[PDB]
Design a protein around this ligand. Structure first.
Ligand SMILES: CNC(=O)c1cc(Oc2ccc(NC(=O)Nc3cc(C(C)(C)C)nn3-c3ccc4ncccc4c3)c(F)c2)ccn1
Length: 308
């Protein structure tokens, strides 16, 4: 019964194309992820899992699956549209976002992640392209998967948000992997530029150590016993302070960033604890007791600041 038109191309993958569209029933803008049923599959397993996942997750800061459409030749997942991703948002402000708004975006990111982590969902591929933001200022987590998006177009960002302990063969694939990426997104919102833009596993680890400093048995118990680190022979860097690099962070902000960017996942501040960090004290007591399904903008003391 509810039908849709395609308006524009948002992203394109191997098996799927994502279109911007519009409901003919409601006039609401949607995203239509159309998956080609080339082989005699029914629906492909990936789509079934994506759908079963997004149906079980109900949170204001996770993208909302609105509808599914099956024809003989395609399966289309219909998501509610949001106006921009974070990178587009940055770009529309000449890479200088209102710091109050940065606080709101970070908070909402942390709210969505905390829910995911409570449902045992590791995101594992956080990056600006996966953070969608609407006119109202609501931020929702996506995973575009493949879908290469339609000047910052087509940048290879594969490793930029990857944590150094995982890049050196840690087997602790916990929700804390995301906490490192949160850190990297925070810096990028705060400065408009990526924190650790490495092309290789070796150079990603390098760039990291150029800011955080080279590890030791103090800063990383058992690090010199690691064979891969032993081989990756880096010069001993002295830690630069994060606050100099990102002056727009207050000392609370920089303190939160440092707690996110711990070499090892065991020691990073969690999403839940990060929401209680003093950095967010300006947003009040009410925001912490909101239902999962309620926008933080329901609070009225939460408002988006005009952007330049
Ligand atoms: C400017 N506006 C726009 O460009 C724009 C574009 C737009 O299009 C889409 C947005 C999101 C999705 N889908 C998802 O995000 N899926 C998802 C979320 C998660 C979470 C819950 C882990 C985050 N896991 N998986 C998810 C889960 C399982 C998967 N299995 C295989 C492959 C992928 C998978 C993804 C989509 F298909 C199209 C919507 C609004 N605005």
């Amino acid at each position: 019964m509810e039908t849709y038109i395609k308006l524009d191309k948002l992203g394109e993958g191997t098996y799927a194309t994502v279109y911007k569209g519009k409901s003919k029933l409601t006039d609401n803008l949607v995203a239509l992820k159309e998956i080609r049923l080339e082989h005699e599959e029914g629906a492909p397993c990936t789509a079934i899992r994506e759908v079963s996942l997004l149906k079980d997750l109900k949170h204001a800061n996770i993208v909302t699956l609105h509808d599914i459409i099956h024809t003989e030749k395609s399966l289309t997942l219909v998501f509610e549209y949001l106006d921009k991703d974070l990178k587009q948002y940055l770009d529309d402000c000449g890479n200088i976002i209102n710091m109050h708004n940065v606080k709101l975006f970070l908070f909402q990111l942390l709210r969505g992640l905390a829910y995911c982590h409570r449902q045992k969902v590791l995101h594992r591929d956080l990056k600006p392209q996966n953070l969608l933001i609407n006119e109202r200022g609501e931020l929702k987590l996506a995973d575009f998967g493949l879908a290469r998006a339609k000047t910052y177009d087509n940048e290879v960002v594969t490793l930029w948000y990857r944590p150094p302990d995982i890049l050196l063969g840690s087997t602790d694939y916990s929700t804390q992997i995301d906490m490192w990426g949160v850190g990297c997104i925070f810096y990028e919102m705060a400065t408009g530029r990526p924190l650790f833009p490495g092309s290789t596993v070796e150079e990603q680890l390098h760039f990291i150590f150029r800011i955080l400093g080279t590890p030791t048995e103090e800063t990383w118990p058992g690090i010199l016993s690691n064979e891969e680190f032993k081989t990756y022979n880096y010069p001993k860097y002295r830690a630069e302070a994060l606050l100099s690099h990102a002056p727009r962070l207050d000392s609370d902000g920089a303190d939160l960033l440092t707690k996110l960017l711990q070499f090892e996942g065991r020691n990073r501040i969690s999403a839940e604890d990060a929401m209680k960090h003093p950095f967010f004290l300006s947003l009040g007591e009410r925001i912490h007791k909101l239902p999962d399904t309620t926008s933080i903008f329901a609070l009225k003391e939460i408002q988006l600041q005009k952007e330049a």
